[model samples]
Target: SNTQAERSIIGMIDMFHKYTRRDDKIDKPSLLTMMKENFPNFLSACDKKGTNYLADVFEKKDKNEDKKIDFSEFLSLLGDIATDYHKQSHGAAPCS
Candidate 1:
């Protein structure tokens, strides 16, 4: 059975592969493009909380300063999103 956790992990992997072009890593342009397409509504929520999430997302996720986002970094980004959404689900404001 495809449990929710399993599905979510697979979905992240699929989404990563969808935008990655070379050696399982995503370039800056591809990363931002992927975000726009995959998480359009997320930016709106960030705006509601006065957080420019997209503005610094790339910088934050590019942890190695290598100018590209690796799979682990991508997971970090997904984790941050999940964390914020989880907070909202508990009736707390995102980024609060």
Candidate 2:
């Protein structure tokens, strides 16, 4: 299970690189769609959450409150996402 999770995290990181590092330039909807397609239960999990906290994280990166997360913003968001994911799994404090 740990191996599987590691692989998944690696894959997700790769996706972050592709979407944020490439020329296509991911927007919010596109980012959501990509997450929905690639991350298995991400969208469904977000849907289950009352406020779509994950979506809100991305939206925050969508500075200017414009509902669009740029590459740099996405990179930062994704790093935080991965950090949180790892911390939660390990039962450790975040940003410590």
Candidate 3:
């Protein structure tokens, strides 16, 4: 078996492919589905901000303003979550 961390990291690729379309990227509607199912914990926290969560995330990671998410953009979304976890480890909470 792979190391625990490597296993988790590689699993991300499958997660992306499972959601990506033939266009080879994720659009907003599917991204909403992805976020809800895969990121429940993070969403519950972030959802405290109200209903703009999907749009906010989409805009946040759509590096080219293309209105869709590429694999790299999806990775950035996860990376932001990891960074947020790191920050919260410093005795802070999420949200304003």
Candidate 4:
């Protein structure tokens, strides 16, 4: 039986493909734009705290210095988001 988490994982891959033009990789600009559109609130919270979360965020997540972000790299971005949200739920400061 398919689980909600499995569907969510598939959805993430689909979302990544939607933004990628070639292969399974996305450029920095599209990645930033997608984040701004889909994750405005998360970005906003960091923004309010003087953290331009989008700025250089892609570079940090790229992991390979290849000038492009792949599905694995994208997952790392989500991992950070998950981590931050988890921290917040426990009353800890969000990752900046």
Flag regions of model 4 displaced more than 4 Å: none
Better of 2 and 3 by lDDT: 3
lDDT of 4: 0.88
What is every candidate's alpha-carbon RMSD to the true fold? 1.6, 6.2, 1.8, 1.3
Ranking by lDDT: 4, 1, 3, 2
Best by TM-score: 4
Per-residue alpha-carbon lDDT of candidate 4 for residues 4-95, written as tens digits (9 for 90 to 100): 99998898888888899767789999999999988898988898888998888988998999999988899999989989999899898665
Clashes of each: 0, 0, 0, 0
Which pairs of residues clash in candidate 1, taking residues 3 or more apart in a chain or in different chains?
Answer: none
> Please, what are the lDDT tens digits per residue for candidate 2 over residues 1-96?
579879987775678666552454576667767666665554454455543655465666766665566656766766765775687578864332
Evaluate all candidate structures by whole-model CA lDDT and list the values in order. Answer: 0.87, 0.62, 0.83, 0.88
TM-score per model over all chains? 0.87, 0.52, 0.85, 0.91
Per-residue lDDT of model 3, residues 1-96, tens digit only? 799889888899989988998988999889989989998877778777564466677877889998889998998989887887788889777643
Ten-residue stretch with the least lDDT total in model 2: 42-51
**Residue range with the least summed lDDT across 10 consecutive positions in model 1:** 40-49
Of the pair 3 and 4, which is ahead by TM-score? 4
Would you give me the overall lDDT of model 2? Answer: 0.62
